[PDB]
Amino acid sequence: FCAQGEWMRLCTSTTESEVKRAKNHLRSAMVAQLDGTTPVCETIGSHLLNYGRRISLEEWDSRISAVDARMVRDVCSKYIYDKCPALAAVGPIEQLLDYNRIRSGMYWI
């Protein structure tokens, strides 16, 4: 209930404060993925294979910095809002229930 709630917040009411912090966490994250030779090498192998070139931290940072509240909301709305999700549940899941109910958690903040 709370989780889907947070997704709905993303689409409808993200704050510049939130993104401002999310961006710093993301920067630290990308930088942290290049901590060593194996991880830098892993990046290269992938970037080439997937983007057909290397995307430097300098570029990532450029892109990451252009992101703002308004943008997060639009992108999220575009991929999350009122979408039929895919669900996998394993274990003692009796208390989680009904695709229908979950599907409804997909709209209205």
Binding site: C84, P85, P92, E94, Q95, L97, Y99, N100, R103
Partner: peptide
């Protein structure tokens, strides 16, 4: 009342969204 009903084991179920069918 949800979570205290029955002791169930080893049953898998597959379902499709209403919009896919």
């Amino acid at each position: 009342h949800f979570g205290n009903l029955a002791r169930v084991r080893h049953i898998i179920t597959y379902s499709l969204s209403p919009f896919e069918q």
